[PDB]
Amino acid sequence: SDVLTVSTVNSQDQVTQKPLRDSVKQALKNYFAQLNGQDVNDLYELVLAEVEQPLLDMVMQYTRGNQTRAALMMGINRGTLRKKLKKYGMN
């Protein structure tokens, strides 16, 4: 049912799959703890940068550098994909 997931180990050394979203939650839950109450700023543009980069990396690995195929595979116009690569200096 659930396609984007990550392996997790438990007390009894049983590896078991968990939805990526569950990690994203934890990641923040922690981030908020760290902050006492220091107003947050561009949390979106932060999380994006944190997700886009792994994603771009992987499809530009799975398509072995093929931007034309990479774009197709993600559903975004090639030119957009170029903009993002440029945006993290992945070109």
Add this chain to the structure above:
Amino acid sequence: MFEQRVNSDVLTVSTVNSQDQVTQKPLRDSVKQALKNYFAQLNGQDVNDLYELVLAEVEQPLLDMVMQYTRGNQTRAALMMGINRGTLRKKLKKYGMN
């Protein structure tokens, strides 16, 4: 002075290591693993939406966790997320968060 915290470490999930020692790793890495695993299952099946797919998995939690923080306050949420109040509303409607 203050020690450096690289953007990688600003958002982190905890993991057990080789020596059964708990430690934070960047969120990036969870995202990598999730795709590395997602491809492995794919086996030549073709993909088209992978961005939206990823985005939807990530946005839900963010909206979710921010709205708990601001205790339902949209004006606050959208401000600390750094987006328009109107789009935050749009996204929230999209993910059935009402």
Add this chain to the structure above:
DNA sequence: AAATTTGGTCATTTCTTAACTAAATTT
């Protein structure tokens, strides 16, 4: 009873897009 937030339109921008190139590159 003030102050804030919600919800909702509206105009301007800014971003994404397909549709086309000619060049470089893979096949």
Add this chain to the structure above:
DNA sequence: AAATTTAGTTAAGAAATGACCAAATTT
């Protein structure tokens, strides 16, 4: 040498934005 990819242009369609406001609410 033909087919595919790249690195661009364009235009035009879509998404995001701040600025409003009137109502609902929270202080």
